[PDB]
Design a protein around this motif. Structure first.
Motif, PDB file in Angstrom:
ATOM      1  N   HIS A  73     -18.223  53.677  63.976  1.00 58.66           N
ATOM      2  CA  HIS A  73     -17.032  54.021  63.067  1.00 58.66           C
ATOM      3  C   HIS A  73     -15.842  53.356  62.996  1.00 58.66           C
ATOM      4  O   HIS A  73     -15.478  52.887  64.062  1.00 58.66           O
ATOM      5  CB  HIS A  73     -16.944  55.549  63.336  1.00 58.66           C
TER       6      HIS A  73
ATOM      7  N   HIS B  73     -17.824  63.318  61.534  1.00 58.71           N
ATOM      8  CA  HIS B  73     -17.039  62.495  60.743  1.00 58.71           C
ATOM      9  C   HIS B  73     -15.745  62.947  60.563  1.00 58.71           C
ATOM     10  O   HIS B  73     -15.425  64.135  60.049  1.00 58.71           O
ATOM     11  CB  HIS B  73     -17.639  62.005  59.238  1.00 58.71           C
TER      12      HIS B  73
ATOM     13  N   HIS C  73     -21.569  56.697  54.931  1.00 59.11           N
ATOM     14  CA  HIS C  73     -19.990  56.623  55.342  1.00 59.11           C
ATOM     15  C   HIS C  73     -19.263  56.306  54.033  1.00 59.11           C
ATOM     16  O   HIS C  73     -19.344  55.463  53.069  1.00 59.11           O
ATOM     17  CB  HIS C  73     -19.654  55.303  56.372  1.00 59.11           C
TER      18      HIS C  73
HETATM   19 CL   LIG Z   1     -17.833  57.659  59.628  1.00 61.87          CL
END
Ligand SMILES: [Cl-]
Ligand SMILES: [Cl-]
Ligand SMILES: [Cl-]
Ligand SMILES: [Cl-]
Lengths: 314, 314, 314
Positions: A73, B73, C73
């Motif tokens: 991330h 997320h 993402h």
């Molecule tokens: Cl992410």
């Protein structure tokens, strides 16, 4: 103690060729619908912090994409986000204790070193006043593809001509070319020369290489382009516009100075219309867009090396 | 109906000790290169919304990192992003229907309750006018490590001295200390005392604990520090600077008031030079940086409890 | 050549019904604690770029959530992030070479087409001057649930009444309704009518459907609402406020014009108090919040179709 990437000056010639081969390899596998074993979930559960002092969208796009291929991330902290309301020491110790890497852009170089000095995780230099390591790796990836043992990319005896201002990008490119046995020639106006601290790092980079790349310094553009395999420029107020008069890269400059018949063009973007002509920019001579995309492949290589392999390059 | 975390006032003494043990445990496993089974992919496919009314980078860094360890997320919605151009009811129903959790920071407390009232998913209080639950959990994690059955962390009879302004952080710390049988003493200038609604929640927190922590209120700093195991302060315009004259935490204050020989120092950051001396801040007495990092471990514990375990703490 | 989603005008009636059934299906599975095989890790390793020209938090929330369910993402690039300091051609070639999809919002429609023209990856239209494809899909999902073979959602002979300004949302809704055999009637003030280029696309959408939806154009609201199954409005300075006098949707308008006994209400949010009454907005007639949530389910369907299935809708 963590190992940082602040400049190409920190890499042996072997270590640099290896980063470039790895990017080339990963690029070929991923663009044909496959994942390298070394990369799959290599960064999962993990955060990479991106610290940016001024806007830099292009750099963001490639770092973001590179981290995600490894399953990690990416965390964006811009100039409205974060040494003003809190000491540089504190910020450095605190952020580094809750992430696995910092990709940072700041103003002065004195700034980035102090941050790295107190970080407990690897720091990679996204761009500073005097260095731009990620760009050099991309540029040599591009050169290596277009002109297609361990301590070399097989590029000995090539010529690069830089025409324009002496800046961060040129500095690192020069240091890389020297390690790779590639000749560089630099045309700049009076007052806009390579700083002598930089000339000192280029010279030190000569040590231990059997055929190092040679440096040439000029005020006349037509001199630099002589026998050049590649021509490079970059973005350059009132004082400047008059000074760079003859510095615009054009078809007429190449023929007039005597560059190779098949010379290629490179610029790291964004491009403005002052440095180079439309005719040149959009010709089949121009490696501009592949060069832009090679940022993605260079970030994957660099993050694998410094974060996953904790600095043991292989 | 979802269960929210708005204040330590919502937790039994058992539930609070359990959150702290869990953070301690997860910290030890992850820092030695392993993943707890309970946490792996626990939040995958899922989004956590972060709603921030004013800048709060430090809080962002730890929430972001905590969510990612669980494979989820984190979504950042700042003050340029989102009750002005749309009713508070609407925003609340709509956002909560497309996420699994909200971590929120607002101004007044009346604001956060109204949001939670209409959210269909658990809300966690990132910081408001009167509470800061995440901070208390971090602070007690830190205390528990440095001074190293189910309804206690084994801290009975300790003393905490708070010197400075009465604010959100102190309020929740006080409520926690009471549940844990820890004594707290509070020095503040005339006009800057604990609000009596807060004194009411501390007193209510006494109920059902066999040895609750005692509260002391003073105007003189030298009185508070007497026999203190830990000394805490916090960030404090023209009116204020004259009022806090003798309130600066110093080596000379500890000896003069008679604190323990090995007293330790705590401040939740960022630090300015008015509240505490450089000599104190950077001594071996200072648990400041571990305390900052314990935010990461406290968020993992809290999000597991409220989002994954849907409020059944174990 | 990649296939883009710029407008419902690009979809056959079969392709449109399929996107809606898929969203309905995925919604039922995920809301009862399961994952569809087709979706699991479908986008892992991959980045989707979100390009927004003006603030649009609501759109962000659902795109972000949709990408993450597929394990990908989402990358936010707002108006402070990114054709001003660099040609539109360049930005388009460069960004598209390092991502798998672009979800974009711009001002004029001429802008979005030029971007798509040079993108090497599928572009989806988040909102522009004349189209809003994602909204239509959500709205028909909602209608399909509330009134609960391959080329139809079984909605033939329904009536929709639009009361207010003629804008992007109405345009695409109209084109969809026509393909689905649903009747639409439009009340607007003099000067605020459907542009004749739009009327041309509605008419072209008639081709090849055995029972197409009919279009009605009026200046009087009481005329539009006659026998309507659903009533829709939208957000509408000095010039405008006097012009929309009788255009406010109210209980008294429905009875007076003669709408169906059980007529339902729809508005795509945010809502201001000028277009519709509080009594209407919050009644059991109002499908407003389900309609807002159906954005999440519509994004999953659309991204699966255009990015994962590379445009082969099934
Ligand atoms: Cl992410
Ligand atoms: Cl920035
Ligand atoms: Cl903010
Ligand atoms: Cl924006």
């Amino acid at each position: 103690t963590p190992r940082h990437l602040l400049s190409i000056a920190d890499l042996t010639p072997t270590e640099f060729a290896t980063l470039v081969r790895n990017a080339s390899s990963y690029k070929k596998t991923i663009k044909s619908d496959s994942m390298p074993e070394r990369l799959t979930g290599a960064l999962s559960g993990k955060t990479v912090a991106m610290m940016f002092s001024k806007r830099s969208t292009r750099t963001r796009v490639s770092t973001e994409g590179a981290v995600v291929k490894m399953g990690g991330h990416p965390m964006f902290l811009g100039k409205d986000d974060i040494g003003v309301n809190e000491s540089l020491y504190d910020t450095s110790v605190v952020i580094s204790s809750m992430v696995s890497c910092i990709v940072a852009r700041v103003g002065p170089h004195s700034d980035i070193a102090n941050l790295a000095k107190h970080s407990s995780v690897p720091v990679i230099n996204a761009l500073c006043d005097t260095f731009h390591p990620l760009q050099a790796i991309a540029d040599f990836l591009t050169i290596h593809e277009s002109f297609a043992h361990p301590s070399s990319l097989g590029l000995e005896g090539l010529k690069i001509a830089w025409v324009g201002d002496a800046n961060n990008v040129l500095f690192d490119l020069a240091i890389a070319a020297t390690k790779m046995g590639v000749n560089v020639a630099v045309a700049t106006p009076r007052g806009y020369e390579i700083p002598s601290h930089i000339v000192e790092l280029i010279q030190k980079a000569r040590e231990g290489v059997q055929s190092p790349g040679n440096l040439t310094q000029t005020t006349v553009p037509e001199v630099a382009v002589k026998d050049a395999d590649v021509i490079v420029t970059d973005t350059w107020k009132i004082k400047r516009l008059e000074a760079f008069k003859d510095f615009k890269v054009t078809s007429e400059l190449a023929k007039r100075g005597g560059a190779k018949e098949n010379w290629k063009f490179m610029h790291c973007l964004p491009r403005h219309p002052e440095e180079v002509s439309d005719e040149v920019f959009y010709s089949e001579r121009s490696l501009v867009f592949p060069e832009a995309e090679n940022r993605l492949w260079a970030a994957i290589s660099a993050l694998e090396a410094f974060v996953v392999n904790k600095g043991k390059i292989a």
